[PDB]
């Protein structure tokens, strides 16, 4: 009983963009930094291009991600700019210059303040709440799949596995392949734990075959050193077995937004107050100001 998806899918000519560098590499496909110029529009857009050789099942994976990226518009979700129909189909999205958030809290852990951490949790809940409003389920929410546009502004990404990573899975998901927005709240909880530990690996050492039994006993990830019981309690609530008991993303916005209004009451970071995080570029425009 759903509404017609009238999102526009833009096909871009290979001539419209230049690849400047390789950002990330796999045999399946590689990600490039690059610039894109709409043909008649006199702008330059910093983009990231995802692309190697193609099994017939390979192209069906990238197109589902493009279908999902093209139907979302939210300040905290990565937006598709278009696709290019060269022999290996290219997905073209907005360049998130500071890279992936997991890598970012590791590289800068000694300059990351409680106000940023609480803002990222707010921005991520907003993204996920937008996804729940649009009746979507991520299935792979993790700090590795949140990208950093500025240090003030993160966006959720990786919709390849989206529908309508065992250490980020919900227990119901691990036992019975069940996936909900509430199962997404679980991985939200694990995602916040990664940030509060500056990128620590959850259940480090423990093999994934062991994860299902542990969680049944009642064990959970431990309270991060910087976390007041308020923040840690919210994580723990995301990890209830009864999924109706986990919080909704709209409540996580409210709660973490309440805490982002006085961040040092809720995260205790040594020296928290002192820390601060940052051709021709004349016709340059960020994707977020390029509207169609
Ligand atoms: C959590 C790991 C991860 O997702 N890493 C990653 C690596 C490559 C591409 C993407 N996807 C992506 N990336 C950007 N922006 C981006 C990522 C990484 C860098 N780095 C780190 C590594 N590096 C070298 C030389 O070793 C170069 C700098 C830089 C940038 O942007 C300048 N933007 C968008 C995506 C997207 F998700 F694919 F759209 C993720």
Numbering used by the authors: 696 to 746, 749 to 861, 877 to 990, 1005 to 1018
Study text:
Activating mutations in the kinase domain of epidermal growth factor receptor (EGFR) are one of the major causes of NSCLCs, among which the most frequently seen mutations are the single site mutation leading to a leucine-to-arginine substitution at residue 858 (L858R) in exon 21, and the deletion mutation in exon 19 resulting in loss of the pentapeptide ELREA (delE746-A750). In this study we determined the crystal structures of EGFR T790M or L858R in complex with the third-generation drug CO-1686, which provide insights into why CO-1686 displays preference towards the EGFR T790M drug-resistant mutation while sparing the wild-type EGFR.
We therefore determined the complex crystal structures of EGFR T790M/CO-1686 and EGFR L858R/CO-1686. The overall structures of these two complexes are highly similar to each other. As expected, CO-1686 covalently binds to EGFR through Cys797 in both structures. The solution exposed N-acetylpiperazine moiety of the compound is coplanar to the methoxybenzene moiety and it bends towards Leu718 and wraps its side-chain in the structures of T790M/CO-1686 and L858R/CO-1686, which would facilitate the binding of the compound to EGFR. In the determined EGFR T790M/CO-1686 and L858R/CO-1686 complex crystal structures, multiple hydrophobic interactions were found to facilitate the binding of the compound to EGFR. The pyrimidine core of the compound forms a hydrophobic interaction with Leu844 primarily; the methoxybenzene moiety forms a hydrophobic interaction with Leu718; while the linker phenyl ring carrying the acrylamide warhead of the compound into proximity to the thiol of Cys797 forms hydrophobic interactions with both Leu718 and Val726 side-chains. A wild-type gatekeeper residue (Thr790) would not afford this beneficial interaction with the compound (such as that observed in the L858R/CO-1686 structure), which explains why this agent prefers binding to the T790M mutant.
